[PDB]
């Protein structure tokens, strides 16, 4: 009868195997998934730290944070998996030849393989999210597109100010996020002002994104911006439903976020709000800078088989399912004759992805089914062009012909004592960048104040040494 224990979450969910795509997968496979992480848990990291206590791991272990999935491997939690792939997985093995760069993502430093990573297609779509303003707002209240933080701001006030959205209600939520964990929501707000609350390249050289001024004077202008009520009061609590929540609710006014799904709510709210026009621009510029640093990575995250499973040949069958045209074709697009048919050997969506009744983007429909859940999978950018606007598409153009968008830091691989050592460090310094700046913006301690004894716990936590392990690993 024999089951398969695997730690699964992503986005706040549990996996439940019998979502459609995972039957399908159990009954191709033979693989009968039993999730350790229970349907109560949501907070991936948590979750993961607490497994790890166990006293077995489950058979399969995926995680969104790959530094740590491969500390994992280096001590020996998760096996070895490049002769189980040579002699097992040809579809892998196939994909690891046809793609080298790809491949170098899943080696660590010792040369194995511990896990195999969840790639975007990223040589088709590299762009991510985009900034993206209620154009009907503007029409309506006078105003010309804000092309400066400046702007923005003064924008955002009028939006919270004159009812742009004509109840006579004071309910504009002028600017949102959506985000399921204080990194997230940190991401969409600090990049407004040229921050970054992680590690970033400056001119061959790795440097802390939180250890910045740049980083304080977002953090600075965001607590201004939050008393004002011109970002959302509930930014760090709202969680991901907070996009189909104030955009339907027709409350909020702009956004940094994923530009597909972003661009898809315009067609989605066409008839429940009049004129809805939430559109793309390129990033407001500060002080002549424009870019941002909102860009795709190759992979996120990723799976590996742990040292107490009973039967990795069977488990890297699993993994190599994936990698078949079939396999790759259900984890992106679903269940054929549901989610989409076949016209003319290639998939199209049906009406219940691309027009579904109750505002549900196509993607979150997808997922609902179970496709594009993050494990250690390829993602195909046609699943991606099948459901997005024309606005969409351009959208992506837009970005890329303007080079706005500035290429992600990859992330780098150490040594076995160093990589522990980052980790640690790592994961310590962000607990304390999560913790102040959501007491600064939040309004209950002072950024002026605390910033430089802020900066002396970092590098009494290790700044300095992480840095020169990343800068090594560079
Ligand atoms: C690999 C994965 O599931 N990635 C998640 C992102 O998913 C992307 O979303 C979109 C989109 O237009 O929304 C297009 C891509 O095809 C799809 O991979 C996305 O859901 C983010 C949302 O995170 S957040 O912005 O920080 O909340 O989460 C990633 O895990
Ligand atoms: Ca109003």
Same mark, same amino acid.
Request: hydrophobic letters at 35%.
């Given at each position: 009868?024999?089951?398969?224990?695997?730690? +699964?979450?992503?986005?706040?969910?549990?996996?439940?195997?019998?979502?459609?795509? !995972?039957?399908?997968?159990?009954?191709?496979?033979?693989?009968?998934?039993?999730?350790?992480?229970?349907? $109560? /848990?949501?907070?991936?990291? /948590?979750?993961?730290?607490?497994?790890?206590?166990?006293?077995?791991?489950?058979?399969?272990?995926?995680?969104?944070?790959?530094?740590?999935?491969?500390?994992?491997?280096?001590?020996?939690?998760?096996?070895?998996?490049?002769?189980?792939?040579?002699?097992?997985?040809? $579809?892998?093995?196939? @994909?690891?030849?046809?793609?080298?760069?790809?491949?170098?993502?899943?080696?660590?430093?010792?040369?194995?393989?511990?896990?195999?990573?969840?790639?975007?297609?990223? !040589? $088709?779509?590299?762009?991510?999210?985009?900034?993206?303003?209620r154009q009907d707002w503007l029409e309506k209240?006078?105003?010309?597109?804000?092309?400066?933080?400046?702007?923005?701001?003064?924008?955002?006030?009028?939006?919270?100010?004159?009812?742009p959205n004509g109840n006579?209600?004071?309910?504009?939520?002028? !600017?949102?996020?959506?985000?399921?964990?204080?990194?997230?929501?940190?991401?969409?707000?600090?990049?407004?002002?040229? +921050?970054?609350?992680?590690?970033?390249? &400056? $001119?061959?050289?790795?440097?802390?994104?939180?250890?910045?001024?740049? @980083?304080?004077?977002?953090?600075?202008?965001?607590?201004?911006?939050?008393?004002?009520?011109?970002?959302? &009061? &509930?930014?760090?609590?709202?969680?991901?439903?907070?996009?189909?929540?104030?955009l339907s609710n027709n409350?909020?006014?702009?956004?940094?976020?994923?530009? +597909?799904?972003?661009?898809?709510y315009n067609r989605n709210l066409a008839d429940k709000i009049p004129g809805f026009n939430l559109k793309?621009?390129?990033?407001?510029?500060?002080?002549?800078?424009?870019?941002?640093?909102?860009?795709?990575?190759?992979?996120?995250?990723?799976?590996?088989?742990?040292?107490? +499973?009973?039967?990795?040949?069977?488990?890297?069958?699993?993994?190599?399912?994936?990698?078949?045209?079939?396999?790759?074709?259900?984890?992106?697009?679903?269940?054929?004759?549901?989610?989409?048919?076949?016209?003319?050997?290639?998939?199209?969506?049906?009406?219940?992805?691309?027009?579904? =009744?109750?505002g549900?983007? =196509?993607?979150?429909?997808?997922?609902?089914?179970?496709?594009?859940?993050?494990?250690?999978? @390829?993602?195909?950018?046609?699943?991606?062009?099948?459901?997005?606007?024309?606005?969409?598409?351009?959208?992506?153009?837009?970005?890329?012909?303007?080079?706005?968008?500035?290429?992600?830091?990859?992330?780098?691989?150490?040594?076995?004592?160093?990589?522990?050592? @980052?980790?640690?460090?790592?994961?310590?310094?962000?607990?304390?960048?999560?913790?102040?700046?959501?007491?600064?913006?939040?309004?209950?301690?002072?950024?002026?104040?605390?910033?430089?004894?802020?900066?002396?716990?970092?590098?009494?936590?290790?700044?300095?040494?992480?840095?020169?392990?990343?800068?090594?690993?560079?």
């Amino acid at each position: 009868p024999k089951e398969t224990t695997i730690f +699964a979450m992503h986005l706040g969910k549990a996996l439940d195997p019998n979502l459609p795509v !995972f039957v399908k997968a159990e009954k191709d496979t033979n693989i009968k998934l039993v999730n350790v992480a229970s349907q $109560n /848990q949501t907070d991936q990291i /948590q979750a993961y730290n607490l497994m790890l206590t166990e006293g077995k791991l489950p058979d399969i272990v995926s995680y969104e944070l790959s530094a740590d999935l491969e500390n994992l491997g280096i001590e020996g939690g998760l096996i070895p998996l490049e002769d189980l792939i040579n002699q097992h997985a040809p $579809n892998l093995k196939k @994909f690891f030849e046809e793609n080298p760069r790809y491949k170098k993502d899943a080696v660590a430093v010792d040369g194995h393989i511990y896990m195999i990573p969840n790639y975007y297609d990223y !040589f $088709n779509i590299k762009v991510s999210q985009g900034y993206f303003i209620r154009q009907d707002w503007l029409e309506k209240l006078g105003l010309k597109e804000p092309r400066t933080v400046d702007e923005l701001y003064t924008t955002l006030k009028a939006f919270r100010e004159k009812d742009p959205n004509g109840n006579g209600k004071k309910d504009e939520v002028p !600017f949102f996020v959506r985000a399921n964990n204080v990194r997230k929501v940190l991401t969409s707000l600090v990049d407004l002002f040229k +921050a970054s609350p992680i590690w970033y390249e &400056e $001119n061959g050289m790795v440097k802390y994104g939180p250890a910045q001024k740049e @980083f304080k004077h977002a953090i600075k202008e965001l607590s201004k911006w939050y008393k004002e009520g011109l970002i959302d &009061e &509930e930014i760090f609590t709202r969680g991901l439903e907070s996009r189909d929540y104030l955009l339907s609710n027709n409350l909020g006014g702009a956004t940094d976020d994923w530009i +597909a799904s972003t661009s898809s709510y315009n067609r989605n709210l066409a008839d429940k709000i009049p004129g809805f026009n939430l559109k793309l621009v390129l990033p407001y510029e500060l002080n002549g800078n424009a870019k941002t640093r909102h860009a795709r990575t190759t992979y996120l995250g990723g799976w590996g088989i742990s040292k107490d +499973a009973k039967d990795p040949v069977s488990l890297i069958k699993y993994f190599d399912y994936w990698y078949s045209v079939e396999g790759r074709r259900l984890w992106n697009f679903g269940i054929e004759g549901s989610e989409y048919t076949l016209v003319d050997g290639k998939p199209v969506f049906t009406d219940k992805v691309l027009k579904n =009744p109750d505002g549900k983007t =196509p993607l979150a429909v997808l997922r609902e089914v179970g496709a594009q859940y993050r494990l250690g999978a @390829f993602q195909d950018a046609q699943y991606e062009l099948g459901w997005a606007s024309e606005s969409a598409k351009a959208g992506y153009k837009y970005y890329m012909d303007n080079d706005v968008v500035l290429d992600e830091l990859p992330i780098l691989k150490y040594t076995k004592e160093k990589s522990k050592e @980052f980790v640690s460090i790592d994961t310590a310094m962000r607990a304390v960048v999560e913790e102040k700046a959501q007491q600064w913006i939040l309004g209950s301690g002072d950024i002026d104040k605390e910033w430089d004894a802020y900066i002396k716990r970092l590098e009494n936590l290790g700044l300095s040494k992480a840095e020169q392990i990343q800068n090594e690993a560079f």
